[PDB]
Amino acid sequence: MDDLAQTKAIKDQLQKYIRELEQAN
């Protein structure tokens, strides 16, 4: 699933980014 896996990895990284924006706000 390296394409699925890779896309999961991108999705996860986007969720990290939101998690840190929200915790400051």
Add this chain to the structure above:
Amino acid sequence: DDLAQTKAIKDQLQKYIRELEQANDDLERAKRA
């Protein structure tokens, strides 16, 4: 369809960050006023 569906989620996530980015542009332009 799992690959297709994950891409849709990522798209929404990216869309959300764009909206969030807009929200902060509003507060920063509020601070400047």
Add this chain to the structure above:
Amino acid sequence: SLFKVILLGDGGVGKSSLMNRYVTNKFDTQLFHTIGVEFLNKDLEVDGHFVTMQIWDTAGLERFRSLRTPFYRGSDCCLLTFSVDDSQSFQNLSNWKKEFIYYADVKEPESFPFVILGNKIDISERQVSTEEAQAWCRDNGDYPYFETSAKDATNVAAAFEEAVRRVLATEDRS
């Protein structure tokens, strides 16, 4: 064939924990709030029928509404989740049904399959009783009601399996 089922409910009632218990038989005390949506696949057999269930987990927090709502559409069955230690999460059920009905755009709401979950029954100090939850289910669609614990695994498997039944029952309604 594939069955999409979706978990809706207030932040922290245990939607993620319910899904991780069912799919991976694990439980986590320090579980992070869901950011947007997640899904997992599980193969099962319900009443002879071999079936793949795609379980959609959503963020309960208000600020993530726009993140979750574009994934309501296409659900065969909705799992409304509240916590028995949280009266507010139970009062909100009407709102979560109304939100699912709008964004998935379910015409024929009178027959669409919902299954209600009172989670965290392992917690002694309850804040919602069994009868008042059972009352609400009888009056707002006559839905199946499951008292569950993601922590203990109580009635978790049964809750998800029942959702497939409700889907099979209306898919056989042609």
Add this chain to the structure above:
Amino acid sequence: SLFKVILLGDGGVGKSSLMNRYVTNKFDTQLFHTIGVEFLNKDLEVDGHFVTMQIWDTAGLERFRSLRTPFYRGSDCCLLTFSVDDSQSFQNLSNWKKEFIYYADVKEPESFPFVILGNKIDISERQVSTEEAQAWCRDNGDYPYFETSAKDATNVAAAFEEAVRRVLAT
């Protein structure tokens, strides 16, 4: 195996426009700025070798640094991109090269293949001349230089093909 080539450079230089032009042969006037990363598969013949390739597209804007840099690992070639109508994008090429090397965690970073792209050469009023870009390429690793137009589809495949040649060389 799968050649990974990745596009870095200032926001709005045309990274997503080059990748989309090369892979799907489309160009758009009002593309959204990239949020994080993207990748498209692309398979081709180079000098008669069949090659499987994955083009990675990264956000130019600084606030998205933390989204792009986890994905530098395992890249085979890096395409440093500027716009010829934007002298600031050209001056920042060194900053992009250093950002790649810092996060890419590549063995022997001094011999890693970079290809340099000066995009938007359809625009007549240039801020960066061909000669100064070539001087910089020659003086900062001796990298191959390609002038491109995603808009007019100028020299777009040639840049990605050369990147493949550089990986094959390595």
